[PDB]
Design a protein around this ligand. Structure first.
Ligand SMILES: [Cl-]
Ligand SMILES: [Cl-]
Length: 129
């Protein structure tokens, strides 16, 4: 599913991501834009043999099981395919764990490089939330 911008904002808010660990909703929308283009089906192989999955490009080394990443820890206790669903629940729950890991949203490279320090509220402008 490719979410609309405000559609994704509303889903993320309903799931309790807005202000989660101090990250306002626009941070999450911005991260999802650059990680996945709001596409739940997005996948990308990493150099180390792991793969990133879903709207927030969650990695198969630490977080989910994809059956092909040796040494995977599956800390979210989910198949990586669950992160591709049109229902973002599993991605949100796992993102909450990731953002609580110690480095906040710096866990998302695209957030660090393209969202952090910018006017992230722009990402939710116009939306009815
Ligand atoms: Cl915001
Ligand atoms: Cl933080």
């Amino acid at each position: 599913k490719v979410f609309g911008r405000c559609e994704l904002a509303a889903a993320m808010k309903r799931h309790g991501l807005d202000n989660y660990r101090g990250y306002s909703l626009g941070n999450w929308v911005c991260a999802a834009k650059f990680e996945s283009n709001f596409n739940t089906q997005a996948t990308n192989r990493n150099t180390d043999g792991s793969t990133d999955y879903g709207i927030l490009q969650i990695n198969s080394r630490w977080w989910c099981n994809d059956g092909r990443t040796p040494g995977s820890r599956n800390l979210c206790n989910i198949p990586c395919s669950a992160l591709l669903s049109s229902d973002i629940t599993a991605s949100v729950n796992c993102a909450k764990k990731i953002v609580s890991d110690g480095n906040g949203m710096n866990a998302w490279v695209a957030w660090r490089n393209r969202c952090k320090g910018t006017d992230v509220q722009a990402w939710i402008r116009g939306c009815r939330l």
